[PDB]
Ligand binder design. Structure first.
Ligand SMILES: [Mg+2]
Length: 59
RNA sequence: GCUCGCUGGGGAUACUGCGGGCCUUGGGACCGGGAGAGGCCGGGGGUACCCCCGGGGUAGGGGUGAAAUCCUAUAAUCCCGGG
């Protein structure tokens, strides 16, 4: 019955804000699309633009 | 010699006292560029902790040398968004 509830979830793709390039940053599961609002994701500046100097900046 | 105590006169001016004059070293006043968790009043913040509401998840959490009381199917511990 529990695994039945897990099958109801779909995956959504998360994009960076517009002025950072709007690139893909990850995926998240949810059954109702309204529940995805106000979720927060943390990424490093190196992932956005590749350079091993700014790996300690978190957005 | 003792009753070391009193009293009439004369002399001296180093020290203490008293009166006058003149100083700046002790102390105080003022000006300059700086130092400091010294005090009082107003404003703005930092993490942390406790309670409440909403979403996920399901059987333990907590605590001791070892345990038990205690919290938890009215959904806890743990994770996320708010007050
Ligand atoms: Mg809940």
């Amino acid at each position: 019955a529990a695994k039945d509830k897990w099958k109801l979830k779909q995956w959504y793709v998360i994009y960076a804000p517009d002025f950072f390039g709007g690139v893909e940053v990850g995926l998240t599961p949810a059954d109702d699309p309204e529940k995805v609002l106000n979720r927060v994701v943390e990424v490093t500046l190196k992932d956005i633009t590749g350079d091993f100097l700014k790996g300690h900046v978190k957005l």
